[PDB]
Design a protein around this ligand. Structure first.
Ligand SMILES: C[C@H](CCC(=O)O)[C@H]1CC[C@H]2[C@@H]3CC[C@@H]4C[C@H](OP(=O)(O)O)CC[C@]4(C)[C@H]3C[C@H](O)[C@]12C
Lengths: 47, 222, 231, 255, 338
């Protein structure tokens, strides 16, 4: 806390809008390659 | 159909099922107890990571676990009973023991686990009371309003004052026990002299009563 | 990790002989065991299989009723009893361990052989029986199954063994893709249904020998004819 | 219908059978998949199945007593229906004695039980209820010799044995409960034990004793027995209807 | 002296809070309000893994997404083949009190730990056809709440001693010690790149630790209760924490503040386990209400309920391809959901 609090005091903090935008971009980019979002046909479902 | 290797894998899984069933059958006939105490209470002297002791009485096995809390007490959910050991010789830490018992009794995950209470000091309590150096009423001002009930089970070699103090402490634990229990579990208060050898029998009888209560509860009798 | 077998000898035709396989260094109780015979001139031929826990028993269609395979897990040993020996049975017998679970590699270890002297199944055929090779080159061998070894679960049950003459055969690649534990990375198996191949790159010493491809799709466990490699 | 006063009896028995099927179906569905089957839940399960069969044959049999009288297939129907009846009484006795044994020896019941005795007793009692169906069936019984032609009181012996063992198990449980430490939950344990005893005796049992006495003395229902048989049938139907209630829904709604 | 240090710490905390507030201009809810919702997600249970005789406390999927390890209170570590429900392995443990599972990324090893304060690494793929304990890592003064495999030789384990430890398995000794938590650390989540990890503790704070440096880089304090579970976002620049206050929270590594709260008025049960979908759009959250929940990670809207357990859901996992989600509960049953 003597120096760690000051070490973490100055972080390269980008705006919350930028973080939200990149999170949403990642979510939309990979939304077409996972099965829990859109169910896959039973032919390609191992379970 | 499944292939030959898949059939052999299924056979291996069936053998594993049989081994697990056998292990569970052997482990079902043991009773798991959770030993708890604050300090200098003689928890390890009750019966003559985790310290685990197995003792067998009346052809039944008991497992006693002590850990040397709100997080790891969650694991002991299927334990048959919590054995809480209290040092009654002193009174400065007696209220700390009362708060500890209240916290354990009112724990969310221990809402169906009964407690066997071992007030571990009997002779030391007698010496402390008879000496008169320490005023028990000073720590607990409820002595003026507390009187020994008409129905008493004193031993042959006892003094009325020592019996009154012992019953006061037992009552001071059982009011906490009975305040919020909803009937799902019951505290079993006892008194040991730290030299008494009939302590595993007491745990055995209390656990038999606990198991009887569970049988009555989940078989529609209670 | 040791399978030492005893038995064998001069037996008159129609006689009976029991031969044993003592297993040490591994959990014999959890391994399904095989007896596999090979003729003095011909290749490998699976004989019998005793499962783990003795729950499942299989024999070849040529020795059914006259051979009895059993195991003694507490004694960690395997038994093969024979009845009515014939001259077409005299061979060299191998005791093979094989454990079956997901990702397992059955036919891991083959014990040293016992020499016995008496005096519907799918076909795995190796087109080439002997090829000339030189160290440091690249060679490829192939064999064909009677029917596709691909299964509905995506596993193609093809196993490659290298005899290395003068010693018992050892597993090289299993399920036609996977590599056995301890074999060099130069070996590589591939192929599709009814057509599989094994490629050896930069052959070194202790590589020449007879290569057998066998199937584990159905329990008759047909072996290949073998493919000898020579300098 | 000997002369009259049958439509109301049929309607009441049909309503009781309908609610019995409803209760047995819901309890069977709940216990088949949404249950753990610890030690006695299997007993409630097969008892509910037996009751479902019992009121199933009850609904199959009773309403045709008014139309297209044949007096022949009804004997077959009651003979078939008496098998789920004995099955249900047998599992009632099994439940009673299992509770008595759990109270008497809790350590053995929890620790030393084989964890499969319930299914063994299940199949044994079902197979035994397949037996003792030859009470009235003195028809080509001798296919060879030492058999009771008319006075075959073995089914009655089995029924009375089930009754006495159930009663003695309940009595022993009550004595053990009253002769120990008193936490005093003796307000609903009394009512549930007495209710089980009554629904076993005041209902259900009258049908069995009527059947035993009717096959003991060959009575053709005459002109005065056209009302007591209907009463016994309705009592048995009510017992089979209320059995799933008292044995599972009381516990389900208790918490 | 002490007063000056306390005043300096308070001023630094106020400055950090002001910096976080200045970097907040629009919440993710406002940004994603103009986005089509996930709708209703109906996962059905395809496989049920029976064979555990006690409450299941942890599980971990394999990297091949077919084998899964599980630990229960009966002192058995069981490796299942999820496709066939076949039991690939089942081995006993020295201590029956085990509350964490780890599956090596290669699959050659598994890990376990609990009230014995020892992390046991078991070798699966070996000779002699049986798995044996390959290593016993000791040095934690408290119970082990989570353990994760950095690789086949490194392992990060968080304990109740209010610490985490990076061990080299070959040496068996602690390579790095991460300290700074004031309460029992209950969970840890390795980053996808495996260079830093987040650890949640009983002090209602989630701390991001750099594995290479060995020092805490960021601290997040949004919860008001012990953080039971933590899960890194698939991107690696965010994570989700689940605590006893019946709320989940989304934090960012670059924004240094909470993003969304996943809570409902009808939910009062604490969180026991959290997980993300493959794309990170759905946050799977195991609860104490005997059932799991699916949250829209971008809109904080419930998508569905995974209610198949008769007791609380203790462990959760999602396969690397996201095909299935495995939930293990205290009713000794593991269920795979698709
Ligand atoms: C439960 C007992 C078995 C006794 C025992 O196991 O110890 C069963 C067996 C045969 C059953 C009788 C058959 C015909 C009897 C005469 C009438 O005939 P129907 O209307 O046509 O049925 C009415 C039914 C009837 C009064 C049945 C009464 C009773 O239910 C019996 C006796």
């Amino acid at each position: 806390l003597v120096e760690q609090l000051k070490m973490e005091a100055n972080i390269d903090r980008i705006k919350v809008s930028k973080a939200a935008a990149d999170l949403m971009a990642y979510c939309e980019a990979h939304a077409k390659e996972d099965p829990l979002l859109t169910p896959v046909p039973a032919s390609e479902n191992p379970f | 159909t499944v292939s030959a290797e898949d059939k052999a894998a299924a056979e291996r899984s069936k053998m594993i099922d049989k081994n697990l069933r056998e292990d569970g059958e052997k482990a079902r006939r043991t009773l798991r107890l959770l030993l708890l105490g604050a300090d200098n209470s003689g928890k390890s002297t009750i019966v003559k990571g985790i310290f685990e002791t197995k003792f067998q009485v009346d052809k039944v096995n008991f497992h006693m676990f002590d850990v040397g809390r709100r997080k790891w007490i969650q694991c002991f959910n299927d334990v048959t009973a919590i054995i809480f050991v209290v040092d009654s010789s002193d009174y400065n830490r007696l209220q700390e023991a009362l708060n500890d018992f209240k916290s354990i009794w009112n724990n969310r995950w221990l809402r169906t686990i009964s407690v066997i209470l071992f007030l571990n000091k009997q002779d030391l309590l007698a010496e402390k009371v008879l000496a008169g150096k320490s005023k028990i009423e000073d720590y607990f001002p409820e002595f003026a309003r507390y009187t020994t009930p008409e129905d008493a089970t004193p031993e042959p070699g006892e003094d009325p004052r020592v019996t009154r103090a012992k019953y006061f402490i037992r009552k001071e634990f059982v009011d906490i026990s009975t305040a919020s229990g909803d009937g799902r579990h019951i505290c079993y208060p006892h008194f040991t002299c730290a030299v008494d050898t009939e302590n595993a029998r007491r745990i055995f009888n209390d656990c038999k009563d606990i198991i009887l209560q569970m049988n009555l509860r989940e078989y529609n009798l209670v | 990790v040791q399978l030492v077998e005893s038995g064998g000898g001069l037996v008159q035709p129609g006689g009976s002989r029991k031969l044993s396989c003592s297993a040490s260094g591994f959990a014999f109780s959890s391994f399904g065991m095989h007896w596999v015979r090979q003729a003095p001139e011909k290749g490998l031929e699976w004989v019998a299989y005793i499962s783990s826990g003795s729950g499942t028993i299989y024999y070849a269609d040529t020795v059914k009723g006259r051979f009895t395979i059993s195991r003694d897990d507490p004694k960690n040993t395997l038994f093969l009893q024979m009845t009515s020996l014939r001259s077409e049975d005299t061979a060299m017998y191998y005791c093979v361990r094989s454990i079956y679970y997901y990702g397992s590699s059955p036919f891991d270890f083959w014990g040293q052989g016992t020499t016995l002297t008496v005096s519907s199944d799918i076909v795995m055929t190796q087109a080439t029986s002997s090829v000339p090779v030189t160290p440091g080159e690249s060679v490829s061998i192939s064999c064909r199954s009677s029917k596709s070894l691909l299964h509905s679960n995506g596993n193609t049950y093809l196993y490659w063994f290298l005899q290395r003459p003068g010693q018992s055969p050892q597993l090289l690649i299993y399920r036609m893709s996977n590599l056995a534990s301890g074999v060099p990375d130069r070996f590589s198996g591939s192929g599709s249904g009814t057509a599989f191949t094994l490629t050896i790159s930069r052959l070194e010493a202790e590589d020449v020998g007879v290569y057998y491809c066998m199937q584990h799709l159905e329990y008759p466990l047909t072996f290949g004819a073998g493919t000898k490699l020579e300098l | 219908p000997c002369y009259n006063q049958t439509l109301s009896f049929t309607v009441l028995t049909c309503i009781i059978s309908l609610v019995g099927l409803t209760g047995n179906a819901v309890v069977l569905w709940l216990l088949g998949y949404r249950m753990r089957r610890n030690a006695v839940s299997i007993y409630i399960l097969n008892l509910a199945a037996a009751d479902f069969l019992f009121l199933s044959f009850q609904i199959i049999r009773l309403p045709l007593r008014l139309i297209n009288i044949s007096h022949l297939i009804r004997k077959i129907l009651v003979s078939v229906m008496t098998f789920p009846y004995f099955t249900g009484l047998s599992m009632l006795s099994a439940i009673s004695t299992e509770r008595c044994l759990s109270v008497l020896w809790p350590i053995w019941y929890r620790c030393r039980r084989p964890t499969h005795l319930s299914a063994v007793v299940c199949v044994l009692l079902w197979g035994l209820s397949l037996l003792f169906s030859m009470l009235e069936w003195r028809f080509c019984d001798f296919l060879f010799s030492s058999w009771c032609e008319t006075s075959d009181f073995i089914p009655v012996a089995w029924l009375i044995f089930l009754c006495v063992v159930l009663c003695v198990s309940s009595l022993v449980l009550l004595v053990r409960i009253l002769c120990g430490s008193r936490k005093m939950p003796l307000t609903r344990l009394y009512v549930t034990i007495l209710l089980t005893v009554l629904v076993f005796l005041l209902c259900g049992l009258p049908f069995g004793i009527l059947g035993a006495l009717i096959y003991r003395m060959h009575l053709n229902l005459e002109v005065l027995y056209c009302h007591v048989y209907l009463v016994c049938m309705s009592l048995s139907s009510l017992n089979s209807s209320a059995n799933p209630i008292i044995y599972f829904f009381v516990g389900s709604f208790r918490q | 002296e002490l007063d000056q240090l306390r005043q300096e710490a308070e001023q630094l905390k106020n400055q950090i809070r002001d910096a976080r507030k200045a970097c907040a201009d629009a919440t993710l809810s406002q940004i994603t309000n103009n986005i089509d919702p996930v709708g209703r997600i109906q996962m059905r249970t395809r496989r049920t893994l029976r064979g555990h005789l006690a409450k299941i406390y942890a599980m971990h999927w394999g990297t091949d997404s077919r084998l899964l390890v599980s630990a229960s209170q009966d002192g058995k570590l069981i490796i299942w083949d999820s496709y066939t429900t076949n039991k690939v392995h089942a081995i006993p443990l020295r201590s029956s009190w085990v509350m964490t599972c780890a599956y090596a990324p290669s699959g050659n090893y598994v890990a376990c730990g609990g009230l014995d304060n020892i992390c046991s690494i078991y070798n699966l793929k070996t000779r002699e056809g049986n798995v044996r304990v390959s290593r016993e890592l000791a040095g934690h003064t408290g119970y082990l709440s989570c353990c994760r495999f950095l690789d086949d030789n490194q392992i990060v384990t968080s304990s109740g001693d209010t610490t985490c430890a990076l061990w080299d398995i070959e040496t068996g000794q602690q390579t790095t010690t991460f300290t700074g938590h004031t309460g029992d650390v209950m969970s840890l989540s390795l980053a996808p790149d495996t260079r830093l990890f987040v650890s949640g503790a009983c002090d209602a704070s989630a701390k991001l630790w750099d594995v290479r440096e060995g020092m805490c880089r960021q601290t997040f304090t949004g919860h008001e209760s012990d953080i039971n579970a933590i899960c890194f976002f698939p991107n690696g620049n965010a994570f989700a924490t689940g605590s006893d206050d019946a709320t989940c929270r989304l934090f960012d590594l670059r924004a240094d503040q909470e993003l969304m709260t996943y809570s409902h008025d009808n939910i009062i049960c604490g969180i026991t386990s959290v997980s993300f979908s493959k794309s990170g759009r759905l946050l799977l959250a195991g609860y104490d209400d005997f059932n799991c929940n699916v949250w829209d990670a971008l809109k904080a809207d419930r998508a569905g309920v995974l209610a198949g357990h008769d007791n609380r859901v203790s462990c959760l996992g999602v396969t690397d391809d996201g095909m299935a989600v495995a939930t293990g509960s205290w009713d000794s049953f593991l269920k795979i959901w698709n």
